């Protein structure tokens, strides 16, 4: 199906405490493959998946070169932004950057993106057409204009439409054994009486990849959010994911309730039923 490559960058200022924290990580789909942390030992961009380890010194030296440039850019931006908003030196502020590309099932370019945030909120984004910017406020219009003047979108667009998808394909082919797999969720259902009149049913999805899943409870065929507790999808730590969904039901009515499961790895949507 569809694939993606994404880089996320966090820059956090440290009032009174010197240089800002800087962290960067690369993902293909829901799998981390590179990182650079400013507090780590190496001060290099480091592999995190086994299929990126086989790239040579030329790759590591260049990604290190470039992530240090990203780092220097955010170092500069924290101070510029502090001035744009006239914020005192006392507070920590956060900058975030995300960029990447989506390819479709034929591995050709579907979409490209680049967002930038300050203090947890949109600052500037490339629009869908990869050709212009959206600025949250008056200070971000300054940025918009600098980035227009220097024609940054054209050079970013080329990256997203070319370099970004060429390397994503490379990584998909190199790491085919782990990146081009769908693991069907392992489902089961648990039962916990509350009283003589009510009981909890919980529907479990385990060991699935990618993280995109849908777990909904139905009653007599009908949608059923009322009484449904639903945890956020979570990482198992072995590269697969987990989730659960619960409902509270009248005792002896358990067979009216079905749990439906939708996942990339499943030929047909599932339907489970607490049978006694």
């Amino acid at each position: 199906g569809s694939h993606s490559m994404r880089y996320f960058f966090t820059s956090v200022s440290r009032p009174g405490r010197g240089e800002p924290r800087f962290i960067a990580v690369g993902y293909v789909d829901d799998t981390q493959f590179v990182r650079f942390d400013s507090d780590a030992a190496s001060q290099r961009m480091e592999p995190r998946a086994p299929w990126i380890e086989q790239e040579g010194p030329e790759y590591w030296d260049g990604e290190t070169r470039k992530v240090k440039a990203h780092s220097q850019t955010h170092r500069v931006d924290l101070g510029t932004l502090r001035g744009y908003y006239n914020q005192s030196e006392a507070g920590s502020h956060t900058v975030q950057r995300m960029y990447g590309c989506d390819v479709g099932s034929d591995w050709r370019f579907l979409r490209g993106y680049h967002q930038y945030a300050y203090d947890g909120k949109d600052y500037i984004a490339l629009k869908e057409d990869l050709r212009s910017w959206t600025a949250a406020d008056m200070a971000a219009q300054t940025t918009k204009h600098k980035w227009e003047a220097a024609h940054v979108a054209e050079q970013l667009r080329a990256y997203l439409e070319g370099t970004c998808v060429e390397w994503l394909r490379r990584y998909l082919e190199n790491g085919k054994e782990t990146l081009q797999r769908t693991d069907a969720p392992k489902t089961h259902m648990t039962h916990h009486a509350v009283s003589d009149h009510e009981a909890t049913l919980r529907c479990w999805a385990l060991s699935f990849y990618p993280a995109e899943i849908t777990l909904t409870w139905q009653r007599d065929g009908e949608d059923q959010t009322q009484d449904t507790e639903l945890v956020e999808t979570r990482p198992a730590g072995d590269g697969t994911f987990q989730k659960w969904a619960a409902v509270v039901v009248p005792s002896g009515q358990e067979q009216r309730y079905t749990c439906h499961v939708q996942h990339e790895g499943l030929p047909k949507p599932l339907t489970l039923r607490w049978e006694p």
Partner: peptide, 9 residues
């Protein structure tokens, strides 16, 4: 692969 063109705000 990372992008080589980030520019300051």
């Amino acid at each position: 692969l990372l992008w080589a063109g980030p520019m300051a705000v």
